């Protein structure tokens with residue numbers, strides 16, 4: 001698979017406020033917010049862009065604005081993933097940007113996420129700052 005974030009720890013920011021830390025291993029995001037949590041994840045590079053596929057993290061763990069979760073969904077096996085465009089500004093500042101959703105069943109081919117552009121509302125985007 002894709003090891004772009006594997007072994008990396010980021011500070012999580014939303015609306016210029018720190019809301020916790022996230023550490024990515026081979027299979028899970030390890031979240032330290034109000035509480036600890038884990039989320040299955042994977043990264044897919046299609047063309048020039050990279051996309052983060054991540055399970056929902058509840059606000060009892062990571063207290064972020066709920067419309068951050070308004071994005072394209074991917075379903076592999078029984079786990080549903082929330083898909084984000086990873087933007088790398090300078091190898092320090094990263095964004096998790098929500099994508100446009102569809103009026104159809106979740107994508108079953110990871111690469112087919114590229115057929116969708118960014119969400120018109122980007123104000124609830126996550127900022128990851130590399131440690």
Ligand SMILES: [Cl-]
Pocket residue numbers: 108109110111
């Ligand atoms: Cl796939």
